[PDB]
Amino acid sequence: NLQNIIYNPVIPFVGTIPDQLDPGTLIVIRGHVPSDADRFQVDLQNGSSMKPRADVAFHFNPRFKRAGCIVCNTLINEKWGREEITYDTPFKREKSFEIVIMVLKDKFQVAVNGKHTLLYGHRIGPEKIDTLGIYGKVNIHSIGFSF
Ligand SMILES: [Cl-]
């Protein structure tokens, strides 16, 4: 089932994942986007080091300017890789949401509000992920894991 690690966390939030992200693992995040929000992101990291900055296996970056979009990338040795931009974004300012990230053998599958949103192939072994961080303009109601 689901096991939240925090409720109404102050943002930015950086927490350690209680178990290994093996295929089949679900990460659930419920929150709300403020009316003035420009962007926010959910980063799956290897450690919480800030200098040198910890590798980010999966960077999920919803942006709200223009028509909006979702930027996904990977950070290795403080170097970003090739961006994967998703334009059919379900996120909206002043609207609550529920993000579900499925960990599959070769990629992450993200659904928002019960509807598939995007996929992202692993660039870093998922077993190296033990930290989850949330930054930017967003209100988080809960972060949980279904191992
Ligand atoms: Cl797969």
Side-chain angles (χ1 to χ4, degrees):
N1 206 291
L2 222 188
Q3 306 292 309
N4 286 164
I5 62 170
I6 196 85
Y7 286 101
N8 308 312
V10 173
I11 302 303
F13 170 82
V14 184
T16 54
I17 306 180
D19 212 326
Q20 180 172 51
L21 294 182
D22 302 301
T25 293
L26 296 175
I27 302 175
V28 183
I29 307 168
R30 298 202 318 146
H32 174 283
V33 184
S35 66
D36 65 317
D38 44 355
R39 58 171 273 173
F40 84 82
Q41 71 205 58
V42 179
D43 299 318
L44 299 191
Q45 313 162 179
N46 165 41
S48 66
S49 181
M50 292 191 263
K51 49 195 301 175
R53 185 180 179 184
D55 276 13
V56 184
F58 183 40
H59 173 61
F60 186 81
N61 185 207
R63 295 177 186 182
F64 305 99
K65 300 174 186 177
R66 292 84 167 179
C69 71
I70 304 179
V71 181
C72 296
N73 208 335
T74 286
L75 180 68
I76 299 167
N77 300 318
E78 301 190 304
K79 285 168 292 189
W80 283 111
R82 166 203 57 191
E83 297 184 314
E84 290 180 39
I85 318 299
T86 289
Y87 291 98
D88 257 14
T89 181
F91 296 105
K92 296 202 304 169
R93 286 152 157 154
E94 210 58 283
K95 288 293 191 176
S96 293
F97 62 74
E98 175 170 293
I99 297 168
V100 172
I101 302 165
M102 293 173 54
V103 179
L104 302 186
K105 175 202 165 79
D106 297 339
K107 62 199 155 179
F108 292 106
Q109 182 168 304
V110 184
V112 180
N113 301 328
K115 153 191 280 295
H116 177 65
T117 302
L118 63 76
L119 294 171
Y120 188 81
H122 299 310
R123 299 186 182 176
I124 296 181
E127 69 296 317
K128 307 187 188 308
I129 307 172
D130 54 25
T131 307
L132 192 166
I134 299 185
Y135 314 86
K137 292 189 175 178
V138 62
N139 292 79
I140 301 300
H141 306 321
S142 68
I143 305 178
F145 298 95
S146 176
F147 297 108

PDB file of all heavy atoms in Angstrom, residues 67-89:
ATOM      1  N   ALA A  67       1.784  28.646 -22.418  1.00  0.00           N
ATOM      2  CA  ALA A  67       0.758  27.615 -22.368  1.00  0.00           C
ATOM      3  C   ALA A  67       1.146  26.572 -21.331  1.00  0.00           C
ATOM      4  O   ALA A  67       0.319  25.755 -20.922  1.00  0.00           O
ATOM      5  CB  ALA A  67       0.603  26.962 -23.739  1.00  0.00           C
ATOM      6  N   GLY A  68       2.411  26.603 -20.919  1.00  0.00           N
ATOM      7  CA  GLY A  68       2.899  25.661 -19.926  1.00  0.00           C
ATOM      8  C   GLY A  68       3.519  24.407 -20.510  1.00  0.00           C
ATOM      9  O   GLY A  68       3.294  24.076 -21.676  1.00  0.00           O
ATOM     10  N   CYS A  69       4.303  23.706 -19.692  1.00  0.00           N
ATOM     11  CA  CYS A  69       4.966  22.474 -20.110  1.00  0.00           C
ATOM     12  C   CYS A  69       5.615  21.795 -18.908  1.00  0.00           C
ATOM     13  O   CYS A  69       5.546  22.300 -17.793  1.00  0.00           O
ATOM     14  CB  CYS A  69       6.054  22.774 -21.143  1.00  0.00           C
ATOM     15  SG  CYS A  69       7.506  23.606 -20.464  1.00  0.00           S
ATOM     16  N   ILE A  70       6.240  20.647 -19.153  1.00  0.00           N
ATOM     17  CA  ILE A  70       6.940  19.895 -18.116  1.00  0.00           C
ATOM     18  C   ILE A  70       8.335  19.543 -18.639  1.00  0.00           C
ATOM     19  O   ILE A  70       8.471  18.858 -19.657  1.00  0.00           O
ATOM     20  CB  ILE A  70       6.227  18.566 -17.757  1.00  0.00           C
ATOM     21  CG1 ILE A  70       4.778  18.829 -17.339  1.00  0.00           C
ATOM     22  CG2 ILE A  70       6.986  17.871 -16.627  1.00  0.00           C
ATOM     23  CD1 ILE A  70       4.004  17.558 -16.997  1.00  0.00           C
ATOM     24  N   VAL A  71       9.369  20.023 -17.959  1.00  0.00           N
ATOM     25  CA  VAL A  71      10.731  19.720 -18.374  1.00  0.00           C
ATOM     26  C   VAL A  71      11.302  18.589 -17.531  1.00  0.00           C
ATOM     27  O   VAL A  71      11.222  18.613 -16.306  1.00  0.00           O
ATOM     28  CB  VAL A  71      11.648  20.945 -18.230  1.00  0.00           C
ATOM     29  CG1 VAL A  71      13.064  20.596 -18.685  1.00  0.00           C
ATOM     30  CG2 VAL A  71      11.088  22.104 -19.037  1.00  0.00           C
ATOM     31  N   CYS A  72      11.871  17.594 -18.200  1.00  0.00           N
ATOM     32  CA  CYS A  72      12.479  16.465 -17.512  1.00  0.00           C
ATOM     33  C   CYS A  72      13.931  16.332 -17.971  1.00  0.00           C
ATOM     34  O   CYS A  72      14.217  16.380 -19.172  1.00  0.00           O
ATOM     35  CB  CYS A  72      11.706  15.174 -17.814  1.00  0.00           C
ATOM     36  SG  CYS A  72       9.989  15.168 -17.203  1.00  0.00           S
ATOM     37  N   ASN A  73      14.846  16.176 -17.015  1.00  0.00           N
ATOM     38  CA  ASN A  73      16.258  16.034 -17.331  1.00  0.00           C
ATOM     39  C   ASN A  73      16.987  15.251 -16.237  1.00  0.00           C
ATOM     40  O   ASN A  73      16.390  14.867 -15.230  1.00  0.00           O
ATOM     41  CB  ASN A  73      16.898  17.413 -17.473  1.00  0.00           C
ATOM     42  CG  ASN A  73      18.092  17.409 -18.409  1.00  0.00           C
ATOM     43  OD1 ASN A  73      18.743  16.386 -18.598  1.00  0.00           O
ATOM     44  ND2 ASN A  73      18.390  18.566 -18.993  1.00  0.00           N
ATOM     45  N   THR A  74      18.280  15.018 -16.450  1.00  0.00           N
ATOM     46  CA  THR A  74      19.118  14.304 -15.490  1.00  0.00           C
ATOM     47  C   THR A  74      20.384  15.108 -15.196  1.00  0.00           C
ATOM     48  O   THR A  74      20.992  15.684 -16.103  1.00  0.00           O
ATOM     49  CB  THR A  74      19.522  12.908 -16.020  1.00  0.00           C
ATOM     50  OG1 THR A  74      18.392  12.026 -15.951  1.00  0.00           O
ATOM     51  CG2 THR A  74      20.663  12.319 -15.193  1.00  0.00           C
ATOM     52  N   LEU A  75      20.771  15.153 -13.925  1.00  0.00           N
ATOM     53  CA  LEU A  75      21.968  15.889 -13.516  1.00  0.00           C
ATOM     54  C   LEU A  75      23.049  14.932 -13.029  1.00  0.00           C
ATOM     55  O   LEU A  75      22.880  14.252 -12.014  1.00  0.00           O
ATOM     56  CB  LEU A  75      21.638  16.881 -12.395  1.00  0.00           C
ATOM     57  CG  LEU A  75      22.803  17.725 -11.861  1.00  0.00           C
ATOM     58  CD1 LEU A  75      23.281  18.706 -12.932  1.00  0.00           C
ATOM     59  CD2 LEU A  75      22.355  18.479 -10.628  1.00  0.00           C
ATOM     60  N   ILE A  76      24.158  14.881 -13.757  1.00  0.00           N
ATOM     61  CA  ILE A  76      25.271  14.017 -13.384  1.00  0.00           C
ATOM     62  C   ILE A  76      26.519  14.877 -13.246  1.00  0.00           C
ATOM     63  O   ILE A  76      26.874  15.624 -14.158  1.00  0.00           O
ATOM     64  CB  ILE A  76      25.499  12.923 -14.439  1.00  0.00           C
ATOM     65  CG1 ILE A  76      24.238  12.056 -14.552  1.00  0.00           C
ATOM     66  CG2 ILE A  76      26.708  12.073 -14.057  1.00  0.00           C
ATOM     67  CD1 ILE A  76      24.218  11.142 -15.754  1.00  0.00           C
ATOM     68  N   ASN A  77      27.166  14.778 -12.090  1.00  0.00           N
ATOM     69  CA  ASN A  77      28.364  15.559 -11.809  1.00  0.00           C
ATOM     70  C   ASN A  77      28.138  17.023 -12.152  1.00  0.00           C
ATOM     71  O   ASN A  77      28.908  17.630 -12.900  1.00  0.00           O
ATOM     72  CB  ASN A  77      29.563  15.008 -12.587  1.00  0.00           C
ATOM     73  CG  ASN A  77      29.872  13.575 -12.224  1.00  0.00           C
ATOM     74  OD1 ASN A  77      29.831  13.204 -11.052  1.00  0.00           O
ATOM     75  ND2 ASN A  77      30.193  12.762 -13.222  1.00  0.00           N
ATOM     76  N   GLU A  78      27.061  17.572 -11.600  1.00  0.00           N
ATOM     77  CA  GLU A  78      26.689  18.968 -11.801  1.00  0.00           C
ATOM     78  C   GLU A  78      26.520  19.370 -13.263  1.00  0.00           C
ATOM     79  O   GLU A  78      26.593  20.549 -13.600  1.00  0.00           O
ATOM     80  CB  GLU A  78      27.707  19.883 -11.114  1.00  0.00           C
ATOM     81  CG  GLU A  78      27.821  19.617  -9.622  1.00  0.00           C
ATOM     82  CD  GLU A  78      28.639  20.663  -8.891  1.00  0.00           C
ATOM     83  OE1 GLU A  78      29.809  20.881  -9.277  1.00  0.00           O
ATOM     84  OE2 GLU A  78      28.109  21.261  -7.928  1.00  0.00           O
ATOM     85  N   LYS A  79      26.288  18.387 -14.125  1.00  0.00           N
ATOM     86  CA  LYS A  79      26.081  18.651 -15.543  1.00  0.00           C
ATOM     87  C   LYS A  79      24.735  18.089 -16.005  1.00  0.00           C
ATOM     88  O   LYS A  79      24.449  16.896 -15.844  1.00  0.00           O
ATOM     89  CB  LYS A  79      27.212  18.037 -16.374  1.00  0.00           C
ATOM     90  CG  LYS A  79      28.520  18.809 -16.303  1.00  0.00           C
ATOM     91  CD  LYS A  79      29.679  18.017 -16.899  1.00  0.00           C
ATOM     92  CE  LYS A  79      30.008  16.811 -16.034  1.00  0.00           C
ATOM     93  NZ  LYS A  79      31.262  16.126 -16.464  1.00  0.00           N
ATOM     94  N   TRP A  80      23.909  18.959 -16.572  1.00  0.00           N
ATOM     95  CA  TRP A  80      22.604  18.542 -17.063  1.00  0.00           C
ATOM     96  C   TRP A  80      22.754  17.820 -18.397  1.00  0.00           C
ATOM     97  O   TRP A  80      23.699  18.069 -19.152  1.00  0.00           O
ATOM     98  CB  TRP A  80      21.679  19.753 -17.239  1.00  0.00           C
ATOM     99  CG  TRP A  80      21.109  20.269 -15.960  1.00  0.00           C
ATOM    100  CD1 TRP A  80      21.401  21.455 -15.345  1.00  0.00           C
ATOM    101  CD2 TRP A  80      20.143  19.613 -15.128  1.00  0.00           C
ATOM    102  NE1 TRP A  80      20.676  21.578 -14.180  1.00  0.00           N
ATOM    103  CE2 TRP A  80      19.896  20.461 -14.024  1.00  0.00           C
ATOM    104  CE3 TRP A  80      19.464  18.389 -15.209  1.00  0.00           C
ATOM    105  CZ2 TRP A  80      18.993  20.124 -13.004  1.00  0.00           C
ATOM    106  CZ3 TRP A  80      18.564  18.051 -14.194  1.00  0.00           C
ATOM    107  CH2 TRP A  80      18.338  18.917 -13.108  1.00  0.00           C
ATOM    108  N   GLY A  81      21.823  16.917 -18.677  1.00  0.00           N
ATOM    109  CA  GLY A  81      21.859  16.192 -19.931  1.00  0.00           C
ATOM    110  C   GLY A  81      20.868  16.801 -20.905  1.00  0.00           C
ATOM    111  O   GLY A  81      20.540  17.984 -20.814  1.00  0.00           O
ATOM    112  N   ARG A  82      20.387  15.975 -21.829  1.00  0.00           N
ATOM    113  CA  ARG A  82      19.426  16.374 -22.854  1.00  0.00           C
ATOM    114  C   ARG A  82      18.007  16.470 -22.278  1.00  0.00           C
ATOM    115  O   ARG A  82      17.508  15.518 -21.669  1.00  0.00           O
ATOM    116  CB  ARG A  82      19.471  15.342 -23.990  1.00  0.00           C
ATOM    117  CG  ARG A  82      18.336  15.385 -24.993  1.00  0.00           C
ATOM    118  CD  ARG A  82      18.211  14.013 -25.662  1.00  0.00           C
ATOM    119  NE  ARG A  82      17.998  12.963 -24.663  1.00  0.00           N
ATOM    120  CZ  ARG A  82      18.060  11.658 -24.908  1.00  0.00           C
ATOM    121  NH1 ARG A  82      18.338  11.219 -26.128  1.00  0.00           N
ATOM    122  NH2 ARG A  82      17.848  10.789 -23.926  1.00  0.00           N
ATOM    123  N   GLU A  83      17.361  17.618 -22.475  1.00  0.00           N
ATOM    124  CA  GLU A  83      16.009  17.831 -21.962  1.00  0.00           C
ATOM    125  C   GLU A  83      14.928  17.125 -22.770  1.00  0.00           C
ATOM    126  O   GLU A  83      15.010  17.030 -23.993  1.00  0.00           O
ATOM    127  CB  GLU A  83      15.670  19.324 -21.922  1.00  0.00           C
ATOM    128  CG  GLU A  83      16.535  20.158 -21.006  1.00  0.00           C
ATOM    129  CD  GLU A  83      16.084  21.609 -20.951  1.00  0.00           C
ATOM    130  OE1 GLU A  83      15.815  22.191 -22.029  1.00  0.00           O
ATOM    131  OE2 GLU A  83      16.012  22.173 -19.836  1.00  0.00           O
ATOM    132  N   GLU A  84      13.915  16.632 -22.064  1.00  0.00           N
ATOM    133  CA  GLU A  84      12.774  15.976 -22.685  1.00  0.00           C
ATOM    134  C   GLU A  84      11.573  16.829 -22.274  1.00  0.00           C
ATOM    135  O   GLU A  84      11.144  16.799 -21.121  1.00  0.00           O
ATOM    136  CB  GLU A  84      12.650  14.530 -22.181  1.00  0.00           C
ATOM    137  CG  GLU A  84      13.769  13.628 -22.704  1.00  0.00           C
ATOM    138  CD  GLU A  84      13.676  12.184 -22.228  1.00  0.00           C
ATOM    139  OE1 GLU A  84      12.549  11.642 -22.150  1.00  0.00           O
ATOM    140  OE2 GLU A  84      14.737  11.578 -21.949  1.00  0.00           O
ATOM    141  N   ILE A  85      11.055  17.612 -23.220  1.00  0.00           N
ATOM    142  CA  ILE A  85       9.931  18.510 -22.956  1.00  0.00           C
ATOM    143  C   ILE A  85       8.562  17.917 -23.290  1.00  0.00           C
ATOM    144  O   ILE A  85       8.358  17.391 -24.380  1.00  0.00           O
ATOM    145  CB  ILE A  85      10.059  19.824 -23.759  1.00  0.00           C
ATOM    146  CG1 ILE A  85      11.505  20.335 -23.746  1.00  0.00           C
ATOM    147  CG2 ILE A  85       9.125  20.869 -23.172  1.00  0.00           C
ATOM    148  CD1 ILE A  85      12.042  20.653 -22.378  1.00  0.00           C
ATOM    149  N   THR A  86       7.632  18.013 -22.339  1.00  0.00           N
ATOM    150  CA  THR A  86       6.261  17.520 -22.508  1.00  0.00           C
ATOM    151  C   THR A  86       5.343  18.739 -22.496  1.00  0.00           C
ATOM    152  O   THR A  86       5.380  19.541 -21.562  1.00  0.00           O
ATOM    153  CB  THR A  86       5.865  16.549 -21.362  1.00  0.00           C
ATOM    154  OG1 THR A  86       6.582  15.314 -21.507  1.00  0.00           O
ATOM    155  CG2 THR A  86       4.377  16.263 -21.382  1.00  0.00           C
ATOM    156  N   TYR A  87       4.526  18.879 -23.540  1.00  0.00           N
ATOM    157  CA  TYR A  87       3.628  20.026 -23.678  1.00  0.00           C
ATOM    158  C   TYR A  87       2.184  19.819 -23.255  1.00  0.00           C
ATOM    159  O   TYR A  87       1.492  20.784 -22.932  1.00  0.00           O
ATOM    160  CB  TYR A  87       3.677  20.530 -25.116  1.00  0.00           C
ATOM    161  CG  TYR A  87       5.004  21.155 -25.439  1.00  0.00           C
ATOM    162  CD1 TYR A  87       5.988  20.433 -26.111  1.00  0.00           C
ATOM    163  CD2 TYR A  87       5.306  22.446 -25.011  1.00  0.00           C
ATOM    164  CE1 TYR A  87       7.245  20.976 -26.342  1.00  0.00           C
ATOM    165  CE2 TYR A  87       6.553  23.001 -25.240  1.00  0.00           C
ATOM    166  CZ  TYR A  87       7.521  22.259 -25.903  1.00  0.00           C
ATOM    167  OH  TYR A  87       8.772  22.793 -26.107  1.00  0.00           O
ATOM    168  N   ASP A  88       1.716  18.576 -23.276  1.00  0.00           N
ATOM    169  CA  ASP A  88       0.352  18.300 -22.839  1.00  0.00           C
ATOM    170  C   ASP A  88       0.420  18.225 -21.329  1.00  0.00           C
ATOM    171  O   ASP A  88       0.424  17.133 -20.756  1.00  0.00           O
ATOM    172  CB  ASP A  88      -0.152  16.965 -23.383  1.00  0.00           C
ATOM    173  CG  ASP A  88      -1.109  17.132 -24.540  1.00  0.00           C
ATOM    174  OD1 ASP A  88      -1.187  18.253 -25.096  1.00  0.00           O
ATOM    175  OD2 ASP A  88      -1.781  16.137 -24.893  1.00  0.00           O
ATOM    176  N   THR A  89       0.490  19.390 -20.693  1.00  0.00           N
ATOM    177  CA  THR A  89       0.589  19.452 -19.245  1.00  0.00           C
ATOM    178  C   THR A  89      -0.769  19.604 -18.581  1.00  0.00           C
ATOM    179  O   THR A  89      -1.585  20.426 -18.991  1.00  0.00           O
ATOM    180  CB  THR A  89       1.500  20.617 -18.803  1.00  0.00           C
ATOM    181  OG1 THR A  89       1.596  20.629 -17.375  1.00  0.00           O
ATOM    182  CG2 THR A  89       0.939  21.954 -19.285  1.00  0.00           C
TER     183      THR A  89
END
